[PDB]
Every structure is written in C-alpha cells, then in structure tokens.
Amino acid sequence: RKRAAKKRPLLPDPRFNDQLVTRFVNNLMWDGKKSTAFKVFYDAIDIIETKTSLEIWKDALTNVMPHVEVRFQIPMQIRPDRKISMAMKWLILYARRRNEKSMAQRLASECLAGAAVKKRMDTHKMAEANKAF
Amino acid sequence: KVIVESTGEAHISSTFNNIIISLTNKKGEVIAWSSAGKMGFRGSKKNTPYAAQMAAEDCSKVALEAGLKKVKVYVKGPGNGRESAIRSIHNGGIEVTEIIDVTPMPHNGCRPPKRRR
Amino acid sequence: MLIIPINIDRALKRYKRKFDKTGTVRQLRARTAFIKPSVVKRAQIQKAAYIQTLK
Amino acid sequence: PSGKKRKRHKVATHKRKKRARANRHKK
RNA sequence: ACUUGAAUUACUGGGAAGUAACUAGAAUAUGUAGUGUAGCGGUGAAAUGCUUAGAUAUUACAUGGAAUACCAAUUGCGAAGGCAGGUUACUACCAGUUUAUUGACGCUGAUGGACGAAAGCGUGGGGAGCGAACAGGAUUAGAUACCCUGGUAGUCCACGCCGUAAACGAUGGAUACUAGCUGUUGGGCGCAAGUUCAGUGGCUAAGCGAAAGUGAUAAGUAUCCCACCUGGGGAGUACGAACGCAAGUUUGAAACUCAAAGGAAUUGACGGGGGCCCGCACAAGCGGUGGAACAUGUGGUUUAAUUCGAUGAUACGCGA
C-alpha cells in the first residue's frame, strides 16, 4: 500500500563524469559527509593504479552482482537495478574488514577478482539447493 | 544379462510424496530405475517438477547407452511430475511413442484408511 | 486406459488436458480418505438445494 | 435451539456409565 | 333396500421390495518365477517401520477375503429399520382403466404380537483392507489425544440373545373442504398441444404461529381414536417387580435446594469465519537501545526526614 516510488534522481560527479561513482560515494558516505568520501574514493582508485582506470573497478563490481536471491526460502531474481546496489553494498561492507592501515588502503579489493566473491558464491550455492520451488 | 532390444517402455509411477521412473525392456525386465528421493531430494520437494525432471534425466542418459531408442511410456498415479518426467526423457535422446495412462481406480474394492483430521 | 498417439510439448499438453478432463485429478483425492454414507448423503441435499435456490 | 440445554446430559450419562463400569465384576 | 366407502376379480404395467442358490471385473494383500540396485514409506518438518538376508519398481501366473466405479439422482420401492455388479427360482406389494362381483363388511386401537440401524453377547468357520484396546515415533511445561508406523476383538458367514439411536419431517393415524406458478416418477385420454388420477421437490397468496417459519404432501377450517406434557436441579436417581447368559431394557419416587431455567428475534462486542481497504505495520535499507563509564527519573533498603502525585500502551530527562 505504498502505491508509488520515485527512484530519487541523481547528478554526476566532476571527475570521471560517471553516474555510478556518485552512487558508490553515496553508499560510502557516513554521518552526511560527501567531500571526505570522494577524497577517500579518489585516493583508493589512485592506489589501485599499480596493477587500468576505474574500468577495472567497475568490472570487479560485476563479479559481486548476484542473479538470484533466496527470500519457505524461495529463490527469485532481484531486479535489473538492485543488482548494482547489492554489489556496491557487499563491496563496501566487506572492504571494512580488511586489516589494512587506511580506508583507501583497505579498499584495494577491486583487484581481488577476497571476501566479495565469496558472498556471491554462497548465495548461488544456497539458491541452487532450493531449486525445486 | 537382460536383452536391451531397441523397443521398450518407461513406467512413471507417481504419488503424493514421491515419483519413480523405470525404463524397462519390452518383456517386463527392468533396465534402469531412478527416483526423486534417490537423486538427493529428501524432503518435501520429492513431489516437484524439477525433482521429477532430474530423476528422469538421471536414468535417461544411463539407459541411452544400452541400446534403447523407442519408448512406450506408461504413466500411473497422481501428483506433479508426470509432465516433466516425459518432457525430460523426450528432450534427452530416447523418443516416446505413447503417453498411455494406466492409473488404477478400484470399483468400490477396499475401505479407504480412516480420513485424517 | 488413456492411450494417446503422437513436437512433444504439444502432445504432452494434449495428454495433460485430457487427463484433467476425464475427471481423475480429483477422483483419487476423494478415495484417499473414507467418507461414510451419513456424510456423503448430506453433500447431495446441500448441493441440490443450492442449485435449486440458484434458479 | 441452544446447545447448553442439551449439555450436562452428556456428563450425567457419562458419569453413571463409568460408575457402572467400575462397579462391575464385584460380586 | 342402495352404491359412493371398503374388499374381490379381469387387462395394462411398476420398481436397490424380500429369501435362497450360482456367477464377473477392477482394485488391495500374499506366494512363485524373470529383470534390476539403494533406497522405500511417512509428515508442517522428522523419527519409529521395511530394506545389500536384494526392498521400492515391473512382467506373467496362482491363492484368498470384502465391497460393487460409470449408470447414480431432493430418482424408485418398503409400515419402519432399510434396500445398489449380473442371473434364476419361490413370494409379496402398488398404480391406472371398458369390465364383472359382495353390499357398510369402515377408522382408530389400552393390555398384546411381530419386525426393528450400529454397537454388544453365545456357539462353529473365515479373516484381503480397515481398525476399539495396546506397543513404539513425533508435538507439548505435561499429551493416557489430534499426527506417523504396527496391531487384537470387531467388521464377514450359518443358528441364535438384547431391543437401544439426532430410530428426525424433533410434525400419530383416518376423512372432508379451501388460490396459483414451476420440475420430475409411473399410468389413462390424446395425430400435437395439452387434460385427469397415484407419488415425489421448490416459490408463494389468504389463513395460522411469540417469531423463525408453515402454507393443498399444512404448522389452514372442522369431527373420531390413541400416546404424551404441567418450573429447573435432585433424576430417568433410590426401592420393589418383569425380561436377559451378561452388558442392560421397561416401570418409576421422595427428602432437600433456587427464583429462576427455556424458545424466537434485535443492538453491540468478539472469532486462531469470509470479502474489500488503510497506517515506518510488515518486507528492503540506515541509525540506535540492551555491552562500558558518567546525568537525571523510579522501584527497593536504611534515616530524625529521605515532601506529594503517575506508577502498560496514555508513568518513569514527568509535574519541576
């Protein structure tokens, strides 16, 4: 009986002029601080310049996109868009467990394509079991 | 030891809690059997189209490498899976030529057992 | 019996709908349990009365 | 009518029945 | 004295109407033989149970018991209980009609006789399935139950015994009158329409009824006969008697206690009844509390006093 949705339109960022970076830093924000989140993301993607650009980050963001979730524990597809919010949430949630020094340092999990693919593998292994529904 | 001449049947006996597929020669000698509970589906999912399909495909490409090409499937009993027990045999090699249903119905023979509350 | 001669999905759907039409998908769920005449004779006087009042 | 009136006549006929059963084989 | 009531006879029919004897198929169970390997069965999920000593599954044959899918139903028959696969024999009953026949031979019916669901009892067989009691598994705080796996009596047959039911249409049997509409069963008259008897359902007018309802198959208006009722509990109890192998059946009080029990309908309330909707109510996401130290509030314990009040949602950083 919510009867509506608005999807909350967004606005792109100056660097990389991309619309996914804005969603990523929005999920990265804490206590309503966007500037420091952008700073941390930029330091992280520049630290990732060891090995290309944010292309490798956005492709690593694909390996954490599940195709079916269990929610009598019935499996079902999630949505064509909630996939890139579960992927971002899982990446950001499991990048805060790395025992590195800084946030930009422990965010170096895009090259681990490492606690991010494990979640998708467990989801697929738990969804392929309850396939008779 | 049993002759596997290329004319046979597939007895699909289903019920309210399981299903059993048996590919059999044209003389009654069973060649290869399979069951939903046999295919690691122990629980309330034995009576499901996916379980029936897996149980059928288990024995399909087992009796296939024996000399069986044409089947005269006999279906018996109620329950789900009668569809995707012939679907995933005709879609897995061996070809079906009949869908004869031989579900037994008594003509007021015996007393049904004590309607359950 | 329900012998049906013979794509495969078309013939399978034909067989399934013939099986649902011949009145058996609900004939065995009635024989799974025991219905004594004292209860099988009221489902007629409560059905005929409904069909009559629906006229 | 109401069932409360027909009630208690099951208990009055069950207690007597159980008493007569428990008083059998007495001699 | 008469035929209109009643009964008999003649012709057309009618049915799961009875008793006895034969016979058929599907299905379940068991056994033998062939094939074949790891499960089968069960539940809201599990376990007990059967299985590598070859189960479940499939084919062929054999054995045995009970009940008769479709037809099949507000159908039909029977006084009621009740009666359902098919065939025969021995009976019984009913309806219509051109007959012929006797002439009130009729209705009801206390004592009484007969029949009388299921369960139960005795003797002798049979026993496939189901299954009281009972044994395990499961749920629960407990489960002597619901659920699951087995299972004795019984259910069946041949002689008997008891005579009880929500044995209900909760409406005794007759006869005669009083509006219609609409199906259906078996007859008659009909080339069809349709009409008239005998049964079986629904709507409804008048009329009855406290109302629900009934309403030509009356709970409508009359007459005859039988049974029963007189506040609730005690109580269908106590005592005596009759019947029965027994279980039990029939008849049937009193002392004592209360001012109430009871039927129909109305408004609200409620339901682990149904239908349609709403709310950060739930589903998703974020941040918390409950963990640690500090501040106030309150309960509790002490004090000469620890001022008073709210101590669920609607009190507890409240009056202040």
UniProtKB/TrEMBL annotation, chain A:
One of its GO terms (biological process) is translation. One of its GO terms (cellular component) is small ribosomal subunit. The keyword Hydrolase does not apply. Keywords: Ribonucleoprotein, Ribosomal protein, RNA-binding, rRNA-binding, tRNA-binding. GO terms for molecular function: rRNA binding; structural constituent of ribosome; tRNA binding. Gene3D superfamilies: Ribosomal protein S7 domain. The keyword Ribosomal protein applies. Belongs to the universal ribosomal protein uS7 family. HAMAP family: Ribosomal_uS7_B. One of the primary rRNA binding proteins, it binds directly to 16S rRNA where it nucleates assembly of the head domain of the 30S subunit. Is located at the subunit interface close to the decoding center, probably blocks exit of the E-site tRNA. NCBIfam families: rpsG_bact. Part of the 30S ribosomal subunit. Contacts proteins S9 and S11. This is Small ribosomal subunit protein uS7. The lineage of its organism: Bacteria, Pseudomonadati, Bacteroidota, Flavobacteriia, Flavobacteriales.
UniProtKB/TrEMBL annotation, chain B:
Part of the 30S ribosomal subunit. Interacts with proteins S7 and S18. Binds to IF-3. GO terms for molecular function: rRNA binding; structural constituent of ribosome. This is Small ribosomal subunit protein uS11. PANTHER family: 40S RIBOSOMAL PROTEIN S14/30S RIBOSOMAL PROTEIN S11. HAMAP family: Ribosomal_uS11. Located on the platform of the 30S subunit, it bridges several disparate RNA helices of the 16S rRNA. Forms part of the Shine-Dalgarno cleft in the 70S ribosome. Pfam families: Ribosomal_S11. One of its GO terms (biological process) is translation. Belongs to the universal ribosomal protein uS11 family.
From TrEMBL, chain C:
The keyword Ribonucleoprotein applies. The keyword Ribosomal protein applies. GO terms for molecular function: structural constituent of ribosome. It holds the Pfam family Ribosomal_S21. Keywords: Ribonucleoprotein, Ribosomal protein. One of its GO terms (biological process) is translation. Coiled coil: none annotated. One of its GO terms (cellular component) is ribonucleoprotein complex. Belongs to the bacterial ribosomal protein bS21 family. This is Small ribosomal subunit protein bS21. It comes from Flavobacterium johnsoniae (Cytophaga johnsonae). The gene is rpsU.
